[PDB]
RNA sequence: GUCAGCAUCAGUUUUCGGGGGCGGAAAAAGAAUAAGGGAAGGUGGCUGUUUAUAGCCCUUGUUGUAAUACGUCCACUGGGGACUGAGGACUGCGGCUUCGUGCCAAGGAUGCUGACAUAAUGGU
RNA sequence: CUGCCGAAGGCAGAAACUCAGAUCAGUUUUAUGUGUAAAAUGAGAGUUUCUAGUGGGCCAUUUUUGGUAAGCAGAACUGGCGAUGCGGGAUGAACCGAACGUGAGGUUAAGGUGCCGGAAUGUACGCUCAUCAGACACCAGAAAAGGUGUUAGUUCAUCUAGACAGCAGGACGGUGGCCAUGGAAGUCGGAAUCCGCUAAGGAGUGUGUAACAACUCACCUGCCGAAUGAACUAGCCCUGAAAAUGGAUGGCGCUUAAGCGUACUACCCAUACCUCACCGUCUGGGUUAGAAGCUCAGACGAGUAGGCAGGCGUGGAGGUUUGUGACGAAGCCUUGGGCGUGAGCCUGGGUCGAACAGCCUCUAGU
RNA sequence: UGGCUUGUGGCAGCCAAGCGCGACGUUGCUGGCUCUUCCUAUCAUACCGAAGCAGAAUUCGGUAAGCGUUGGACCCACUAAUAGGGAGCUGGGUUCCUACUGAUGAAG
């Protein structure tokens, strides 16, 4: 699965730069090693800081402060496509930022044939205001009187003696 | 060259800044 | 049943020839 | 889920490929299988496409002695047998013996209409097909590919359902009598703490 | 002589279970209980409002030094199954034992028992 | 017959002796600019001498120039093949794993878990319906694009001052503006295309009329109450042509997949990996209590050309076995038994009738 | 022995959806005699759509390969039509088994 990490890093201090600036990024990766490499290439492509002359100063996994409250997360991401450039913004209702990112990765691999390396996440933000929600299906979930029967009921022990119920 | 030794990295002077790709 | 006019399965010369000439196409566009 | 000598499967509402695969695995396990009522097997895909599939199957024939050419079987039971045997190693003695353990029939003949008929949930269309999907019936594809015994089976099935309904009503009445005497008996409440 | 069963072991190995530390935001949550803030997908009330005859969200205190969760470790431990028994007096390295021809899971299996012999194994 | 070493597109081995070395490396650092020089790791490193076989070619890789509808041609390096069995890709000289003694057990790689087929008709989230779907494999030839198929997005639009649509109505009067004509009044046809009114009626969007007239939009008002529209991108789907007997994602078949994409577990097995036994080769230690022997330990095992070593069998000769034999030699047959990895050897039974064999040497029309 | 192959020519300019190119457009000039089967890319026959199609006759296009596509020296007749292709024999020109078809035949 995925875990959210904060990676703080800087280049090695020298005489030219006695106090190098400290760069922190919030990013998602299965483990710390992938997170550090994910961060290093991001730092290379944004600020041209080489991996050799830099160092990861702080690694910290982050847990969801309120995993028991359903939230709506809007995700700004950039995609590499045939043209090599695209921008998308999706909304997912889930109780955890990590799960929202996992759902985003599954949806994009399902729709646009996107892989982990092809997807770079710009921002995952929480949308508390109902009006700020843009997606109609999210608004459908947010309606106060939501109700619906179970979808995809679908139901070793081969050779059942009776016919299936698949109803109530 | 040996591996880099443990040291300190004071941030009160330069607090970490959020970077987004 | 296949239900096709052209077989979906390919011959070994044909499948090998794609990697022969697909690589050359990348050489040409380079 | 216990080894019986003979398993009678009422193929109504099942999917041809899924039921064939389950049956083909049971035959290699060494179990006699009787698949009754084969004119009710369901196949995914709309009827016109399935008939085009079958009519393409007729096209396969020898250019010398079509008598030795492919044998196109039109009965729904034989259609199921062809599906099953394609999932078996019938070129060997093991697969050939496995085929001998399968009896696929049209309707429910009298030797098997008085026996319990289990169903396979892994092949049932209701549990395995998304609602709103077009399908077809083998007993219908057979009639428009050459099978000429549809009316007789339907008539003999209406008779069978009438007789079975009369039998069930008699058995239900006897079961009601036994059920009424059940709570009348005392030990059924006296020491029923074991859950029975 | 043949084939078995079990027990105690040694080598290899697979599969469940318990106990205990140690780390992270000294988990995050959560519960219970005191402040303040905000409101809703607006409850009682009267479409509109701010806990009332439902409640929710945010911050802080507290119960607290809570648990859990994951990671990690134990020279902590309880079981189940399978393959193997090479070597052939004595030394060696070790632990108990007061030393002891002392004992021991410590430089490679022993012990107990049963059935069959016209059967069983093995060969063709 | 077996074992060991083992290529080549100057090699591999053999013998003769250096130093227990800073002596070399299909290597990486440090310094100076792929060259050179002076830390890491690994390895015992070497020198002269002679002597078998080969000096070819196929495939792919990255560096360029000449190129054309279109491929293509010529270089350098790199590997694989060739001497190479095994697992998988339905099967295969060049694809993915893996380098091979005889076995037992465990675990995997690549690929897989609907049935054929050993292994989850597992879990979770999406996409897709194809009257000639997909499982294909940079989807590269057709390829540029079409679609009132679907799901997502990106950028601009109006919207309880009532959105789009829908019904009701207005959509005018100067004016039949002017040339143009049988007949043209906005609408056969030639430049616009102005104005009074507005909330709006375009010298007029189309149909139509010989000409008219009449209807429509494009433009506004009444009712009606909420979202709606346009242009692009992405995934799947249809199409983007192909013939000639039957027909192939390998087959059966599969449509909340057994197709496509991702994520997570569980599971399957190669000669591969690990533990053990055994065979052989090499190497190392020890051995005065068949020395051509004994003993302990470790590593290793494809193999063509080629090199080295040890054995099995056949005819004859010398020596030996107080050797075997008419109470049955040799030979031959055999569903008998035993030994050796093997060449082969011994033996039981039957037949048979007069010679034959082991050991150490010699020899060859072996 | 290319998933080959088929219906739309060559040069220049103007645009210009867009990314110096730039698509469509737009303008400038000179071998025959008999034989089994298959494909449709249909000549005729069947049924349809369009056209100044009044009728008759006809043109083009669609589904369609079920069934036909001749007789004589490109020529001239017949015919509804004389459509196009794939997978035993002869002329002028250079100096065993297996298949196919019929026939028996032991056997639950």
PDB file of N, CA, C and O (backbone and C1' of nucleotides) in Angstrom, chain A residues 1 82 86-90 105-107 109-115 134-135 137 152-154 156, chain F residues 120-127 151-155 233-236 256-257 260-264:
ATOM      1  N   UNK A   1       0.826  -1.200   0.000  1.00  0.00           N
ATOM      2  CA  UNK A   1       0.000   0.000   0.000  1.00  0.00           C
ATOM      3  C   UNK A   1       0.864   1.256   0.000  1.00  0.00           C
ATOM      4  O   UNK A   1       2.073   1.190  -0.218  1.00  0.00           O
ATOM      5  N   UNK A  82       0.856  11.090 -24.548  1.00  0.00           N
ATOM      6  CA  UNK A  82       1.449  11.134 -25.882  1.00  0.00           C
ATOM      7  C   UNK A  82       2.109  12.483 -26.137  1.00  0.00           C
ATOM      8  O   UNK A  82       3.258  12.556 -26.590  1.00  0.00           O
ATOM      9  N   UNK A  86      -0.132  17.132 -19.500  1.00  0.00           N
ATOM     10  CA  UNK A  86      -1.555  17.291 -19.241  1.00  0.00           C
ATOM     11  C   UNK A  86      -1.733  17.653 -17.773  1.00  0.00           C
ATOM     12  O   UNK A  86      -0.880  17.353 -16.935  1.00  0.00           O
ATOM     13  N   UNK A  87      -2.855  18.305 -17.473  1.00  0.00           N
ATOM     14  CA  UNK A  87      -3.174  18.727 -16.116  1.00  0.00           C
ATOM     15  C   UNK A  87      -4.592  18.261 -15.820  1.00  0.00           C
ATOM     16  O   UNK A  87      -5.504  18.499 -16.619  1.00  0.00           O
ATOM     17  N   UNK A  88      -4.775  17.606 -14.676  1.00  0.00           N
ATOM     18  CA  UNK A  88      -6.080  17.120 -14.255  1.00  0.00           C
ATOM     19  C   UNK A  88      -6.315  17.451 -12.790  1.00  0.00           C
ATOM     20  O   UNK A  88      -5.377  17.631 -12.009  1.00  0.00           O
ATOM     21  N   UNK A  89      -7.594  17.530 -12.428  1.00  0.00           N
ATOM     22  CA  UNK A  89      -8.011  17.781 -11.053  1.00  0.00           C
ATOM     23  C   UNK A  89      -9.227  16.917 -10.759  1.00  0.00           C
ATOM     24  O   UNK A  89     -10.283  17.105 -11.372  1.00  0.00           O
ATOM     25  N   UNK A  90      -9.081  15.980  -9.830  1.00  0.00           N
ATOM     26  CA  UNK A  90     -10.138  15.045  -9.477  1.00  0.00           C
ATOM     27  C   UNK A  90     -10.535  15.232  -8.018  1.00  0.00           C
ATOM     28  O   UNK A  90      -9.841  15.886  -7.237  1.00  0.00           O
ATOM     29  N   UNK A 105      -4.710   6.826  -8.081  1.00  0.00           N
ATOM     30  CA  UNK A 105      -3.795   6.038  -8.900  1.00  0.00           C
ATOM     31  C   UNK A 105      -4.527   4.902  -9.605  1.00  0.00           C
ATOM     32  O   UNK A 105      -4.262   4.616 -10.778  1.00  0.00           O
ATOM     33  N   UNK A 106      -5.442   4.235  -8.897  1.00  0.00           N
ATOM     34  CA  UNK A 106      -6.209   3.154  -9.507  1.00  0.00           C
ATOM     35  C   UNK A 106      -7.110   3.669 -10.620  1.00  0.00           C
ATOM     36  O   UNK A 106      -7.223   3.041 -11.678  1.00  0.00           O
ATOM     37  N   UNK A 107      -7.769   4.810 -10.396  1.00  0.00           N
ATOM     38  CA  UNK A 107      -8.651   5.372 -11.415  1.00  0.00           C
ATOM     39  C   UNK A 107      -7.870   5.777 -12.659  1.00  0.00           C
ATOM     40  O   UNK A 107      -8.315   5.530 -13.786  1.00  0.00           O
ATOM     41  N   UNK A 109      -4.851   4.720 -13.702  1.00  0.00           N
ATOM     42  CA  UNK A 109      -4.398   3.516 -14.390  1.00  0.00           C
ATOM     43  C   UNK A 109      -5.548   2.826 -15.109  1.00  0.00           C
ATOM     44  O   UNK A 109      -5.340   2.183 -16.143  1.00  0.00           O
ATOM     45  N   UNK A 110      -6.763   2.943 -14.574  1.00  0.00           N
ATOM     46  CA  UNK A 110      -7.926   2.339 -15.208  1.00  0.00           C
ATOM     47  C   UNK A 110      -8.411   3.136 -16.411  1.00  0.00           C
ATOM     48  O   UNK A 110      -8.911   2.548 -17.375  1.00  0.00           O
ATOM     49  N   UNK A 111      -8.277   4.463 -16.377  1.00  0.00           N
ATOM     50  CA  UNK A 111      -8.827   5.320 -17.421  1.00  0.00           C
ATOM     51  C   UNK A 111      -7.777   5.738 -18.445  1.00  0.00           C
ATOM     52  O   UNK A 111      -7.919   5.446 -19.634  1.00  0.00           O
ATOM     53  N   UNK A 112      -6.714   6.405 -18.004  1.00  0.00           N
ATOM     54  CA  UNK A 112      -5.731   6.976 -18.913  1.00  0.00           C
ATOM     55  C   UNK A 112      -4.478   6.122 -19.051  1.00  0.00           C
ATOM     56  O   UNK A 112      -3.492   6.584 -19.635  1.00  0.00           O
ATOM     57  N   UNK A 113      -4.498   4.892 -18.537  1.00  0.00           N
ATOM     58  CA  UNK A 113      -3.348   3.987 -18.594  1.00  0.00           C
ATOM     59  C   UNK A 113      -2.106   4.652 -18.005  1.00  0.00           C
ATOM     60  O   UNK A 113      -1.050   4.734 -18.634  1.00  0.00           O
ATOM     61  N   UNK A 114      -2.248   5.135 -16.776  1.00  0.00           N
ATOM     62  CA  UNK A 114      -1.208   5.895 -16.102  1.00  0.00           C
ATOM     63  C   UNK A 114      -0.507   5.035 -15.061  1.00  0.00           C
ATOM     64  O   UNK A 114      -1.145   4.253 -14.352  1.00  0.00           O
ATOM     65  N   UNK A 115       0.810   5.180 -14.980  1.00  0.00           N
ATOM     66  CA  UNK A 115       1.631   4.441 -14.035  1.00  0.00           C
ATOM     67  C   UNK A 115       2.143   5.386 -12.956  1.00  0.00           C
ATOM     68  O   UNK A 115       1.977   6.606 -13.033  1.00  0.00           O
ATOM     69  N   UNK A 134     -16.767  20.553  -7.053  1.00  0.00           N
ATOM     70  CA  UNK A 134     -17.149  20.697  -8.453  1.00  0.00           C
ATOM     71  C   UNK A 134     -17.751  19.434  -9.052  1.00  0.00           C
ATOM     72  O   UNK A 134     -18.553  19.532  -9.986  1.00  0.00           O
ATOM     73  N   UNK A 135     -17.392  18.260  -8.543  1.00  0.00           N
ATOM     74  CA  UNK A 135     -17.793  17.012  -9.176  1.00  0.00           C
ATOM     75  C   UNK A 135     -19.217  16.652  -8.775  1.00  0.00           C
ATOM     76  O   UNK A 135     -19.569  16.693  -7.592  1.00  0.00           O
ATOM     77  N   UNK A 137     -20.808  13.736  -8.951  1.00  0.00           N
ATOM     78  CA  UNK A 137     -20.949  12.487  -8.210  1.00  0.00           C
ATOM     79  C   UNK A 137     -20.549  12.665  -6.750  1.00  0.00           C
ATOM     80  O   UNK A 137     -21.138  12.041  -5.860  1.00  0.00           O
ATOM     81  N   UNK A 152     -24.176  -4.412  -7.059  1.00  0.00           N
ATOM     82  CA  UNK A 152     -23.253  -5.523  -7.294  1.00  0.00           C
ATOM     83  C   UNK A 152     -23.314  -6.531  -6.144  1.00  0.00           C
ATOM     84  O   UNK A 152     -22.314  -6.833  -5.488  1.00  0.00           O
ATOM     85  N   UNK A 153     -24.523  -7.043  -5.905  1.00  0.00           N
ATOM     86  CA  UNK A 153     -24.713  -8.020  -4.838  1.00  0.00           C
ATOM     87  C   UNK A 153     -23.918  -9.295  -5.106  1.00  0.00           C
ATOM     88  O   UNK A 153     -23.283  -9.838  -4.194  1.00  0.00           O
ATOM     89  N   UNK A 154     -23.950  -9.793  -6.346  1.00  0.00           N
ATOM     90  CA  UNK A 154     -23.099 -10.884  -6.811  1.00  0.00           C
ATOM     91  C   UNK A 154     -23.367 -12.183  -6.045  1.00  0.00           C
ATOM     92  O   UNK A 154     -22.764 -13.222  -6.334  1.00  0.00           O
ATOM     93  N   UNK A 156     -15.556 -23.210  -0.997  1.00  0.00           N
ATOM     94  CA  UNK A 156     -15.685 -23.788  -2.329  1.00  0.00           C
ATOM     95  C   UNK A 156     -17.148 -24.107  -2.616  1.00  0.00           C
ATOM     96  O   UNK A 156     -17.792 -23.436  -3.425  1.00  0.00           O
TER      97      UNK A 156
ATOM     98  P     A F 120      -5.696 -24.235  -6.478  1.00  0.00           P
ATOM     99  O5'   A F 120      -6.539 -22.900  -6.662  1.00  0.00           O
ATOM    100  C5'   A F 120      -6.039 -21.664  -6.179  1.00  0.00           C
ATOM    101  C4'   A F 120      -7.139 -20.646  -6.037  1.00  0.00           C
ATOM    102  C3'   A F 120      -7.858 -20.260  -7.320  1.00  0.00           C
ATOM    103  O3'   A F 120      -8.882 -21.181  -7.660  1.00  0.00           O
ATOM    104  C1'   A F 120      -7.288 -18.311  -6.096  1.00  0.00           C
ATOM    105  P     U F 121      -9.128 -21.610  -9.188  1.00  0.00           P
ATOM    106  O5'   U F 121     -10.282 -20.632  -9.687  1.00  0.00           O
ATOM    107  C5'   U F 121     -11.564 -20.628  -9.066  1.00  0.00           C
ATOM    108  C4'   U F 121     -12.354 -19.397  -9.439  1.00  0.00           C
ATOM    109  C3'   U F 121     -13.664 -19.192  -8.680  1.00  0.00           C
ATOM    110  O3'   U F 121     -13.868 -17.797  -8.469  1.00  0.00           O
ATOM    111  C1'   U F 121     -14.101 -19.277 -10.994  1.00  0.00           C
ATOM    112  P     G F 122     -13.939 -17.207  -6.977  1.00  0.00           P
ATOM    113  O5'   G F 122     -12.814 -16.080  -6.958  1.00  0.00           O
ATOM    114  C5'   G F 122     -11.440 -16.420  -6.864  1.00  0.00           C
ATOM    115  C4'   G F 122     -10.845 -15.933  -5.568  1.00  0.00           C
ATOM    116  C3'   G F 122     -11.118 -14.478  -5.226  1.00  0.00           C
ATOM    117  O3'   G F 122     -12.391 -14.290  -4.633  1.00  0.00           O
ATOM    118  C1'   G F 122      -8.822 -14.939  -4.924  1.00  0.00           C
ATOM    119  P     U F 123     -13.266 -12.990  -4.983  1.00  0.00           P
ATOM    120  O5'   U F 123     -12.570 -11.827  -4.147  1.00  0.00           O
ATOM    121  C5'   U F 123     -12.425 -11.934  -2.740  1.00  0.00           C
ATOM    122  C4'   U F 123     -11.510 -10.867  -2.194  1.00  0.00           C
ATOM    123  C3'   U F 123     -11.807  -9.443  -2.630  1.00  0.00           C
ATOM    124  O3'   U F 123     -12.875  -8.851  -1.913  1.00  0.00           O
ATOM    125  C1'   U F 123      -9.492  -9.855  -2.825  1.00  0.00           C
ATOM    126  P     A F 124     -13.896  -7.860  -2.660  1.00  0.00           P
ATOM    127  O5'   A F 124     -12.988  -6.627  -3.096  1.00  0.00           O
ATOM    128  C5'   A F 124     -12.423  -5.771  -2.114  1.00  0.00           C
ATOM    129  C4'   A F 124     -11.687  -4.607  -2.730  1.00  0.00           C
ATOM    130  C3'   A F 124     -12.339  -3.943  -3.928  1.00  0.00           C
ATOM    131  O3'   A F 124     -13.410  -3.086  -3.577  1.00  0.00           O
ATOM    132  C1'   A F 124     -10.024  -4.212  -4.328  1.00  0.00           C
ATOM    133  P     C F 125     -14.571  -2.771  -4.642  1.00  0.00           P
ATOM    134  O5'   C F 125     -13.927  -1.668  -5.593  1.00  0.00           O
ATOM    135  C5'   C F 125     -13.457  -0.439  -5.060  1.00  0.00           C
ATOM    136  C4'   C F 125     -12.606   0.317  -6.048  1.00  0.00           C
ATOM    137  C3'   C F 125     -13.232   0.594  -7.403  1.00  0.00           C
ATOM    138  O3'   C F 125     -14.129   1.690  -7.374  1.00  0.00           O
ATOM    139  C1'   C F 125     -11.004  -0.158  -7.690  1.00  0.00           C
ATOM    140  P     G F 126     -15.423   1.700  -8.324  1.00  0.00           P
ATOM    141  O5'   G F 126     -14.972   2.591  -9.564  1.00  0.00           O
ATOM    142  C5'   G F 126     -15.283   2.204 -10.892  1.00  0.00           C
ATOM    143  C4'   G F 126     -14.158   2.545 -11.835  1.00  0.00           C
ATOM    144  C3'   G F 126     -14.415   2.266 -13.307  1.00  0.00           C
ATOM    145  O3'   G F 126     -15.166   3.291 -13.933  1.00  0.00           O
ATOM    146  C1'   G F 126     -12.293   1.421 -12.706  1.00  0.00           C
ATOM    147  P     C F 127     -16.412   2.924 -14.878  1.00  0.00           P
ATOM    148  O5'   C F 127     -15.753   2.701 -16.310  1.00  0.00           O
ATOM    149  C5'   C F 127     -14.700   3.537 -16.767  1.00  0.00           C
ATOM    150  C4'   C F 127     -13.968   2.918 -17.929  1.00  0.00           C
ATOM    151  C3'   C F 127     -14.832   2.195 -18.947  1.00  0.00           C
ATOM    152  O3'   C F 127     -15.461   3.078 -19.857  1.00  0.00           O
ATOM    153  C1'   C F 127     -12.935   0.877 -18.431  1.00  0.00           C
ATOM    154  P     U F 151     -21.627   8.028 -20.347  1.00  0.00           P
ATOM    155  O5'   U F 151     -20.201   7.923 -19.648  1.00  0.00           O
ATOM    156  C5'   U F 151     -19.907   6.862 -18.751  1.00  0.00           C
ATOM    157  C4'   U F 151     -18.466   6.897 -18.314  1.00  0.00           C
ATOM    158  C3'   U F 151     -17.962   8.237 -17.804  1.00  0.00           C
ATOM    159  O3'   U F 151     -18.323   8.486 -16.458  1.00  0.00           O
ATOM    160  C1'   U F 151     -16.400   7.335 -19.331  1.00  0.00           C
ATOM    161  P     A F 152     -18.136   9.952 -15.831  1.00  0.00           P
ATOM    162  O5'   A F 152     -16.602   9.989 -15.404  1.00  0.00           O
ATOM    163  C5'   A F 152     -15.918  11.221 -15.252  1.00  0.00           C
ATOM    164  C4'   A F 152     -14.466  11.092 -15.638  1.00  0.00           C
ATOM    165  C3'   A F 152     -13.703  12.398 -15.783  1.00  0.00           C
ATOM    166  O3'   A F 152     -13.252  12.904 -14.539  1.00  0.00           O
ATOM    167  C1'   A F 152     -13.271  11.022 -17.653  1.00  0.00           C
ATOM    168  P     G F 153     -13.949  14.197 -13.891  1.00  0.00           P
ATOM    169  O5'   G F 153     -12.769  15.261 -13.808  1.00  0.00           O
ATOM    170  C5'   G F 153     -12.642  16.282 -14.783  1.00  0.00           C
ATOM    171  C4'   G F 153     -11.403  16.100 -15.622  1.00  0.00           C
ATOM    172  C3'   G F 153     -10.909  17.351 -16.330  1.00  0.00           C
ATOM    173  O3'   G F 153     -10.106  18.163 -15.493  1.00  0.00           O
ATOM    174  C1'   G F 153     -11.025  15.576 -17.879  1.00  0.00           C
ATOM    175  P     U F 154     -10.562  19.662 -15.141  1.00  0.00           P
ATOM    176  O5'   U F 154      -9.882  20.539 -16.281  1.00  0.00           O
ATOM    177  C5'   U F 154      -8.496  20.416 -16.562  1.00  0.00           C
ATOM    178  C4'   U F 154      -8.141  21.110 -17.851  1.00  0.00           C
ATOM    179  C3'   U F 154      -8.821  22.448 -18.080  1.00  0.00           C
ATOM    180  O3'   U F 154      -8.194  23.516 -17.391  1.00  0.00           O
ATOM    181  C1'   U F 154      -9.016  21.134 -20.027  1.00  0.00           C
ATOM    182  P     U F 155      -9.079  24.711 -16.785  1.00  0.00           P
ATOM    183  O5'   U F 155      -9.372  25.640 -18.044  1.00  0.00           O
ATOM    184  C5'   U F 155      -8.314  26.080 -18.883  1.00  0.00           C
ATOM    185  C4'   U F 155      -8.840  26.645 -20.177  1.00  0.00           C
ATOM    186  C3'   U F 155      -9.970  27.651 -20.043  1.00  0.00           C
ATOM    187  O3'   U F 155      -9.510  28.950 -19.715  1.00  0.00           O
ATOM    188  C1'   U F 155     -10.510  26.075 -21.721  1.00  0.00           C
ATOM    189  P     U F 233      -8.136  16.975 -30.182  1.00  0.00           P
ATOM    190  O5'   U F 233      -7.559  16.435 -28.800  1.00  0.00           O
ATOM    191  C5'   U F 233      -6.402  17.016 -28.219  1.00  0.00           C
ATOM    192  C4'   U F 233      -6.182  16.512 -26.817  1.00  0.00           C
ATOM    193  C3'   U F 233      -6.354  15.015 -26.621  1.00  0.00           C
ATOM    194  O3'   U F 233      -5.218  14.268 -27.018  1.00  0.00           O
ATOM    195  C1'   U F 233      -7.523  16.163 -24.924  1.00  0.00           C
ATOM    196  P     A F 234      -5.399  12.786 -27.612  1.00  0.00           P
ATOM    197  O5'   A F 234      -5.614  11.884 -26.318  1.00  0.00           O
ATOM    198  C5'   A F 234      -4.674  11.909 -25.254  1.00  0.00           C
ATOM    199  C4'   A F 234      -5.232  11.272 -24.006  1.00  0.00           C
ATOM    200  C3'   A F 234      -5.835   9.890 -24.179  1.00  0.00           C
ATOM    201  O3'   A F 234      -4.862   8.863 -24.240  1.00  0.00           O
ATOM    202  C1'   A F 234      -7.293  11.219 -22.893  1.00  0.00           C
ATOM    203  P     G F 235      -4.992   7.707 -25.345  1.00  0.00           P
ATOM    204  O5'   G F 235      -5.982   6.655 -24.677  1.00  0.00           O
ATOM    205  C5'   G F 235      -5.617   5.984 -23.482  1.00  0.00           C
ATOM    206  C4'   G F 235      -6.739   5.128 -22.955  1.00  0.00           C
ATOM    207  C3'   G F 235      -7.486   4.288 -23.975  1.00  0.00           C
ATOM    208  O3'   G F 235      -6.788   3.112 -24.344  1.00  0.00           O
ATOM    209  C1'   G F 235      -9.028   5.330 -22.516  1.00  0.00           C
ATOM    210  P     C F 236      -6.982   2.487 -25.811  1.00  0.00           P
ATOM    211  O5'   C F 236      -8.375   1.720 -25.724  1.00  0.00           O
ATOM    212  C5'   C F 236      -8.574   0.669 -24.791  1.00  0.00           C
ATOM    213  C4'   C F 236     -10.040   0.410 -24.552  1.00  0.00           C
ATOM    214  C3'   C F 236     -10.864   0.059 -25.781  1.00  0.00           C
ATOM    215  O3'   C F 236     -10.740  -1.296 -26.171  1.00  0.00           O
ATOM    216  C1'   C F 236     -11.994   1.710 -24.534  1.00  0.00           C
ATOM    217  P     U F 256     -20.408  -8.585 -17.936  1.00  0.00           P
ATOM    218  O5'   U F 256     -20.350  -9.188 -16.464  1.00  0.00           O
ATOM    219  C5'   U F 256     -19.109  -9.438 -15.821  1.00  0.00           C
ATOM    220  C4'   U F 256     -18.870  -8.477 -14.684  1.00  0.00           C
ATOM    221  C3'   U F 256     -18.320  -9.078 -13.400  1.00  0.00           C
ATOM    222  O3'   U F 256     -16.915  -9.272 -13.449  1.00  0.00           O
ATOM    223  C1'   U F 256     -20.099  -7.582 -12.902  1.00  0.00           C
ATOM    224  P     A F 257     -16.232 -10.535 -12.726  1.00  0.00           P
ATOM    225  O5'   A F 257     -16.356 -11.713 -13.791  1.00  0.00           O
ATOM    226  C5'   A F 257     -16.338 -11.440 -15.188  1.00  0.00           C
ATOM    227  C4'   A F 257     -15.476 -12.415 -15.949  1.00  0.00           C
ATOM    228  C3'   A F 257     -13.974 -12.248 -15.738  1.00  0.00           C
ATOM    229  O3'   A F 257     -13.338 -13.515 -15.886  1.00  0.00           O
ATOM    230  C1'   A F 257     -14.479 -11.920 -18.010  1.00  0.00           C
ATOM    231  P     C F 260      -6.103  -9.214 -21.317  1.00  0.00           P
ATOM    232  O5'   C F 260      -6.431  -7.657 -21.268  1.00  0.00           O
ATOM    233  C5'   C F 260      -6.371  -6.862 -22.443  1.00  0.00           C
ATOM    234  C4'   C F 260      -6.608  -5.407 -22.132  1.00  0.00           C
ATOM    235  C3'   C F 260      -5.824  -4.847 -20.958  1.00  0.00           C
ATOM    236  O3'   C F 260      -4.482  -4.531 -21.278  1.00  0.00           O
ATOM    237  C1'   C F 260      -8.075  -4.181 -20.775  1.00  0.00           C
ATOM    238  P     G F 261      -3.313  -4.884 -20.235  1.00  0.00           P
ATOM    239  O5'   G F 261      -3.495  -3.803 -19.081  1.00  0.00           O
ATOM    240  C5'   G F 261      -3.378  -2.421 -19.374  1.00  0.00           C
ATOM    241  C4'   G F 261      -3.585  -1.555 -18.155  1.00  0.00           C
ATOM    242  C3'   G F 261      -2.991  -2.049 -16.849  1.00  0.00           C
ATOM    243  O3'   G F 261      -1.589  -1.870 -16.754  1.00  0.00           O
ATOM    244  C1'   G F 261      -5.169  -1.234 -16.463  1.00  0.00           C
ATOM    245  P     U F 262      -0.726  -2.814 -15.779  1.00  0.00           P
ATOM    246  O5'   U F 262      -1.057  -2.266 -14.320  1.00  0.00           O
ATOM    247  C5'   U F 262      -0.757  -0.925 -13.965  1.00  0.00           C
ATOM    248  C4'   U F 262      -1.477  -0.502 -12.710  1.00  0.00           C
ATOM    249  C3'   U F 262      -1.124  -1.262 -11.444  1.00  0.00           C
ATOM    250  O3'   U F 262       0.097  -0.835 -10.868  1.00  0.00           O
ATOM    251  C1'   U F 262      -3.468  -1.039 -11.597  1.00  0.00           C
ATOM    252  P     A F 263       1.040  -1.894 -10.114  1.00  0.00           P
ATOM    253  O5'   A F 263       0.331  -2.085  -8.702  1.00  0.00           O
ATOM    254  C5'   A F 263       0.034  -0.960  -7.890  1.00  0.00           C
ATOM    255  C4'   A F 263      -0.860  -1.323  -6.734  1.00  0.00           C
ATOM    256  C3'   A F 263      -0.486  -2.577  -5.967  1.00  0.00           C
ATOM    257  O3'   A F 263       0.592  -2.380  -5.070  1.00  0.00           O
ATOM    258  C1'   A F 263      -2.814  -2.557  -6.361  1.00  0.00           C
ATOM    259  P     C F 264       1.628  -3.573  -4.788  1.00  0.00           P
ATOM    260  O5'   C F 264       0.843  -4.522  -3.781  1.00  0.00           O
ATOM    261  C5'   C F 264       0.240  -3.991  -2.610  1.00  0.00           C
ATOM    262  C4'   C F 264      -0.676  -4.992  -1.955  1.00  0.00           C
ATOM    263  C3'   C F 264      -0.096  -6.375  -1.734  1.00  0.00           C
ATOM    264  O3'   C F 264       0.751  -6.428  -0.600  1.00  0.00           O
ATOM    265  C1'   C F 264      -2.299  -6.554  -2.591  1.00  0.00           C
TER     266        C F 264
END
